[PDB]
Symmetry: C3
Subunit: 275 residues, 3 copies
Amino acid sequence: QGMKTRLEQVLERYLNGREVAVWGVPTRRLLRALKPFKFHTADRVDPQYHYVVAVTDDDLTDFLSDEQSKSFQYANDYLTFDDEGGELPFERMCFNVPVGRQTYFGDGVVGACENGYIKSIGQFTSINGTAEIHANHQLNMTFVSDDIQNFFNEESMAVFQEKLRKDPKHPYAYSKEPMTIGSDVYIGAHAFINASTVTSIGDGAIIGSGAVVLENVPPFAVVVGVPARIKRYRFSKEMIETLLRVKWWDWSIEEINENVDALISPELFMKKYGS
Amino acid sequence: MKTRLEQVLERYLNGREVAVWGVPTRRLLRALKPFKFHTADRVDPQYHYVVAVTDDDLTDFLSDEQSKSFQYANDYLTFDDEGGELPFERMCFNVPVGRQTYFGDGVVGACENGYIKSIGQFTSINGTAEIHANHQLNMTFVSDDIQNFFNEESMAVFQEKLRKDPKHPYAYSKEPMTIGSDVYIGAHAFINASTVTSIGDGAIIGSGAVVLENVPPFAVVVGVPARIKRYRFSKEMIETLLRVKWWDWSIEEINENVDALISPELFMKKYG
Amino acid sequence: GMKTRLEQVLERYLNGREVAVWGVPTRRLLRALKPFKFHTADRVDPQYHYVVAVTDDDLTDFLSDEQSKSFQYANDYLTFDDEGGELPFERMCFNVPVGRQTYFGDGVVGACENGYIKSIGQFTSINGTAEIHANHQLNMTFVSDDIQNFFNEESMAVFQEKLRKDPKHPYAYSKEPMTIGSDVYIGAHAFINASTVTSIGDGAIIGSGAVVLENVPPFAVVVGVPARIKRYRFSKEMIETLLRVKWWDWSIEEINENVDALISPELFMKKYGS
Ligand SMILES: CN[C@@H]1[C@@H](O)[C@@H](O[C@@H]2[C@@H](O)[C@H](O[C@H]3O[C@H](CN)CC[C@H]3N)[C@@H](N)C[C@H]2N)OC[C@]1(C)O
Ligand SMILES: CN[C@@H]1[C@@H](O)[C@@H](O[C@@H]2[C@@H](O)[C@H](O[C@H]3O[C@H](CN)CC[C@H]3N)[C@@H](N)C[C@H]2N)OC[C@]1(C)O
Ligand SMILES: CN[C@@H]1[C@@H](O)[C@@H](O[C@@H]2[C@@H](O)[C@H](O[C@H]3O[C@H](CN)CC[C@H]3N)[C@@H](N)C[C@H]2N)OC[C@]1(C)O
Ligand SMILES: [Cl-]
Ligand SMILES: [Mg+2]
Ligand SMILES: [Mg+2]
């Protein structure tokens, strides 16, 4: 019966006894998510009394164009409802998928979370909204269709599903681990990652615009092309091992600011933590 | 022409009232004009046919306790899903589309633009696939909307040269393309409507492929531009498949012969 | 504030009529319509009404309706949710000049709003799925941008200072916004990198799927990932003539008087080539 929306996860932490002020045309899905909370359609809004929910990105453009929005802080005081992959200051869940802090993605990757193709997405990871993650259909039967199964009776379905589960090429991502997407990852526009054949986008990996990723991407590799190939690595092997031990992406806010100089300068990072 | 929803209601509404689940639109109210309808409150499949307006509306309906007795297509549909699969052969802007065949808004647009002659049965097209034609490449300009400034005589001269162009700008002077049955087309794939007339039965078009020429039956093509990497089956089994046309079988026949559909070795034994 | 496409068109063509809204209104639309008299469309007449279709789907509904028969595009009707749609006059898109008969989709509107685009020329055709984005910084320990939401004032200043000095222009810092020329074509799923591109030359053709990482010369055709020059549309001498003549700045009268040279490059060179 429908898991927790991003908006509900935010309102549970930040509403703080205010009323939700809906900026835009309310939808069936929004009204259901708002049932636990006091809400009304927005007119004059004040962050002391109101939490502003823009329904669509279009409504958010309008809200942020309004003089009233000046005193509203992102996430703390306002959000967009139709933004399930939007970044948040806290770790959360997108369907059954853990998502780290300040990590964002778009509708294709939200769907991949819904489909079970993703195990988790790390911290401080930036995924262009047009990136896509999908699986392969079966390639070892007479047909390649999936929706033919809407015509299968109980006995036919059983035989079909049995064969799918034994296929070592993992059609529909069967019999494989869902993919882990690391921290400090960047994925470009129109990139594609194949969920039948990829289990790992390593920490720090960069996926170029338009890349077609068919196998795992090592940590801090930069991959480009159709099919994607490793073009370079962001850092030396010694610094990659250092990054994988330090895991700055799990630091507290205090520590991130404490060490902003090492985050900004790789040379300083190596002097401090490379031992 | 008739929307997907109107085709479905003509088949299955069976004298019920349409219960609109979500905010109604101009397009929806026009599609519902010959039918009785009301905004949904309490619904029951004996009295109501539920129309979720958007995909998000459908998510909310299918999460609701009231949806348990509603069967897909027989009792509910999404209005904004012109490319959605159906258990019967339908029309998409008077493009014939086979059973259990789905595609995204780009291919819906290609149907509306006249680029597609028909789409076969059991064909799976990822929602981000695109089908577009080329502009003219043999004039001083490549713009199309410059024509909004052409008077009647200039327009006629422009239109006549486009018609004579062997490279088929805007898919002029060529057949709209046939997309076969049991076809798979992956994400961000592109098919050029100026230069493609046939995606053969059984073809597989890889994610990101840019298809500039016809794809033979059961060819697997990948790359920019798309090249044949392999065929799915031997020449002998392709000939058998193109005769048998299992994609035209009844539901009874599909279940009767599920073993041949699961196992290509058994299909060849049985039919080849 | 900045004027929507609709507001600019109404200021030009409304001519004292009343706006007849066709479709479910939005908060964006109602704000744009505040200077004007408007009502929900019922019976409409282009002598009396200017029809605003809210969505593309609303427009399809309106144009299928018998009442639309005498309505002329732009002069009498428009789609609100079509900020990159073509117009017969030069307009602004989020304070970016856009030439006549030039269209583009929501990715390029976004790039206008983000400050990535200086101007877009006349008679330019950009597929709806084209994208224009910048690079993140590539010279620090992290590639994330939204880590900066955790930066205090001191940390943010140190971060912004390095970004400003980066010669590779992360987030399009310290570079000119890009000019997109006239009579340009940009295909489906094309990508143009705003960190490293300042010019798409007049006449350029960017093929579908192309990933454009550097300037595209005038009348060059580029394809692939990354994008490379496939061919030029015309000879060097004709390119030089086209850049002199600038037919894309001609009046409607000049376009029609010279349609033979616009259709035939040979005739263009005969009339304008030295
Ligand atoms: C669902 N809506 C999202 C939309 O909200 C927005 O998401 C932004 C994303 O574009 C930003 O980042 C992008 O744009 C920045 C300039 N604004 C420069 C850095 C770039 N990666 C992230 N920092 C925050 C997301 N909420 O753009 C992508 C999208 C998919 O349209
Ligand atoms: C208009 N909405 C459609 C949306 O309903 C959906 O369409 C699905 C399509 O993704 C499914 O298939 C896809 O996803 C499956 C797991 N859910 C695995 C197989 C894969 N091809 C088809 N079986 C049915 C369509 N109606 O995804 C594409 C879309 C364009 O967003
Ligand atoms: C915001 N809506 C726009 C939508 O209006 C439409 O835009 C068309 C564009 O596709 C047309 O052109 C395209 O389609 C033509 C057949 N219709 C063939 C030529 C091709 N470049 C331009 N001539 C006019 C724009 N308003 O398609 C793209 C879009 C992004 O969906
Ligand atoms: Cl936007
Ligand atoms: Mg038969
Ligand atoms: Mg004169």
